[PDB]
Amino acid sequence: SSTASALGKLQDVVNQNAQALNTLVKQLSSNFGAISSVLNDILSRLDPPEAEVQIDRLITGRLQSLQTYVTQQLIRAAEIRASANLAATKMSECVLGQS
Amino acid sequence: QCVNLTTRTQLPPAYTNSFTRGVYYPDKVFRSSVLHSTQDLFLPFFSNVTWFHNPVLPFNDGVYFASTEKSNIIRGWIFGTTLDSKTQSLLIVNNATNVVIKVCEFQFCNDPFLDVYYMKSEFRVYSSANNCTFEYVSQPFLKNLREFVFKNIDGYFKIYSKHTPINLVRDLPQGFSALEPLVDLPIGINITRFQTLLALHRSAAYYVGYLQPRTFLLKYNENGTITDAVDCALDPLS
């Protein structure tokens, strides 16, 4: 009841997930080499024959960011699953019997 | 129609600290209870601010002007390079009524002055106004700490202002307050110097500082009012 910072692991897992989501959603505000960071502006400001190039740059940048996020999520999920297996083994052994 | 002066009065150039003053809203966006980091032109924390008790001083990138004014003696400012009819000049005045902003090739003499007569009527700061460009009139700007920030970027003249009641005598207050935006002028000039306007008794203590480009962190409360800030390039803790 009294001591603080007694639940570091759950708090840091939640913080890591929140930070990953935050940086992923923050990555949408970059030019990636194009003339603007928002799609509607370039759609409504000029002729398609260049809008295709701008959209191509946006697409490749956003695809790279999404792939990086997915890979990080997969790694963290694997680690969490291993921890859950260890917890299940401990529950089965040290509760339903004497170790 | 302006004359020289006999007494070449000397205003001692004192130096003192800035503490945590010189912060202004940088944009037009409302944010609530959030920490935001931005890089722009600001006055560095704990800098050296100059104190005068109207010599020509450079404008540089931007200026910050503070007055512990009583009775509102100061009337306005002058902006330009050579301060003559040869070069386009800017002149801001705030008399008892609405302010006047003029953009003309004014002919400036040594000491412009407005005078007060003991029924307020006198204006002979300059002599001739040949070619005028812009004219602006709005509400008047004016113990009483008045803080102003002047910037000129890409042909835009930005002015920020803040008014405060104060009771301390000499030292700059050790508090925090953000200068709300006041006006923007869409006129492009190559200003490099500036003056001060005094209405002498025809019957001077203020602080000045410069700006530098650097990064700051601002805190927005639940009501969207800036309440605290941190300067990056100040300390390892910063």
């Binding site: 935050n22 959603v25 923050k26 949408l28 505000s29 509607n40 409504s44 400001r45 000029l46 002729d47 | 037009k28 966006v29 409302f30 944010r31 609530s32 959030v34 890409d154 042909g155 835009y156 709300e180 935006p181 923007d184 869409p186 009501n223 969207g224 009012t225």
Partner: protein, 366 residues
Amino acid sequence: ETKCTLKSFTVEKGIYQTSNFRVQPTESIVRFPNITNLCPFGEVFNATRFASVYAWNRKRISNCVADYSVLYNSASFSTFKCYGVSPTKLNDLCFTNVYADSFVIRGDEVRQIAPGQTGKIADYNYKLPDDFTGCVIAWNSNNLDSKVGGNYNYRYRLFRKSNLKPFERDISTEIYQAGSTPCNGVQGFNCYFPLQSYGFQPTNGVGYQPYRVVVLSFELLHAPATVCGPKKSTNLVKNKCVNFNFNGLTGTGVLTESNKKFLPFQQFGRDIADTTDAVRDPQTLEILDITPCSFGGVSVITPGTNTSNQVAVLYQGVNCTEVPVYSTGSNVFQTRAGCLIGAEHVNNSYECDIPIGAGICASYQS
């Protein structure tokens, strides 16, 4: 749909995901401050006298309602070349502090008015910055600025010590010494007047008939724009998924009344990660809130093609208020996971067969 997505003619018992759905916008709304002054173009396009190229006339235009259709449809313009934006779209934007420059040049010199171009006028009278954005207009004035005796009132610079920086004006008329002897303001050998005059005659062929040229320079995103286009303001609907064009800032969503307290100099705000959420309409000066239109994936619950053929449909994270042939169907149930249609709720509690979520799931009987 389940069979198509699963790519098989038989389907095993369980829950499957097929596609997504969204709430499409219904109508559009635009809000602009009621400013109706007509932006002056006749005084600069249909003007009588045009200044010479070495003294190009520059005017700053701001805070006006301008139409570009009248410029675009007219066939009197020989050259109509816009650089920063597509022409047909100038009616769909808003700016401030626009610049218009006007002069008259020789017929052959119209090609010299282009970014990154070199010549005689291009580097001695008028220079276009390499990052120029805007548009250029040129048309014919053979029958307006040519006399039988010839017009000699139009001039241009011919000599200078060096080039000219972009967007500069030179008016000085000083004797230019091309030799190695001071001239002392005496026009003689190797001492030429810097200016020269045109010989516009009605018999002159093309490339010599005078042309009138006006260039328009725009800006993008320096301040709240005031030079808008010909837009008709509309009313304000609420609590519906629509798209909006608030003073040029566009987007789709649902608008609701807000209790947020602004400060007298903002127009809009955002919460985090550059996600605008609050706006202030120019007309009423009222603060609103924007919420993204509803969306979500759909799921099909089946007991197996081997047994029966009746299925249930689940919409994830969607309030049972705007679902839409399966709009009403059977008894519609609302769950913490969304809305489920095609199954009957009971007050029993059995072993879970096909997990659904939030502690509830379905089974077969119906």
